[PDB]
UniProtKB/TrEMBL annotation:
Residues the record lists as binding heme b 7: H55, K58, Q88, H89
Stated name of the protein: Dehaloperoxidase B
Organism in which the protein naturally occurs: Amphitrite ornata
Residues binding heme b 5: N37, H89
Binding positions (heme b 10): K58, H89
């Protein structure tokens, strides 16, 4: 289930973080509006840059902390507030997060690895609603 999925992801965190973020960027080409340094590079060209894996891995580390602290796939309001108030997230809207989790769930369902894709869809939806409640537009 969801708890095991956190363990699966953490067990190979850098690789999953890169592949899920790439799935997001490729599903939503307009979303590079927030990623000017990744324009004009293929998936393997991006994975070849240490800064890409370094940043993705730190992103998904925090995502796994928020997922692990959630109750029944409902994130804590304090974690949502953290994500809202991060300087790196100024100008984001919940639509940015909605698209990330749509791509993440799609990646999981296409994967050979078992994932509880329903729980991740719920987690993404509850994260969006919590981000809104914490003041994200
Ligand atoms: C639960 C979802 C997310 C989590 C846990 C998260 C977490 C993080 C973390 C930890 C960093 C700092 C990483 C580092 O040290 O390099 C970061 C940076 C950033 N994040 Fe998020 N993020 C999430 C969703 C998003 C989404 C959906 C977007 C936009 C579509 C976004 C845009 C950015 C940007 C632009 C930066 C700055 C990159 C830079 O210039 O260093 N994040 N995020
Ligand atoms: C490059 O790493 C990321 C940067 C911003 C948002 C997400 Br999600 C990432 O995985």
């Amino acid at each position: 289930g969801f708890k095991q999925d956190i363990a699966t992801l953490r067990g190979d965190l850098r690789t999953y973080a890169q592949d899920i973020f790439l799935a997001f960027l490729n599903k939503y080409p307009d979303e590079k509006r927030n990623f000017k340094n990744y324009v004009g590079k293929s998936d393997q060209e991006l994975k070849s840059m240490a800064k890409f894996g370094d940043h993705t891995e730190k992103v998904f580390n925090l995502m796994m902390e928020v997922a692990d602290r959630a109750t029944d796939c409902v994130p804590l309001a304090s974690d949502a507030s953290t994500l809202v108030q991060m300087k790196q997230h100024s100008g984001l809207t919940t639509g940015n997060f909605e698209k990330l989790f749509v791509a993440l769930v799609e990646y999981m369902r296409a994967s050979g690895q078992s994932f509880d894709s329903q729980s991740w869809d719920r987690f993404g939806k509850n994260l969006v609603s919590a981000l809104s409640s914490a003041g994200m537009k």
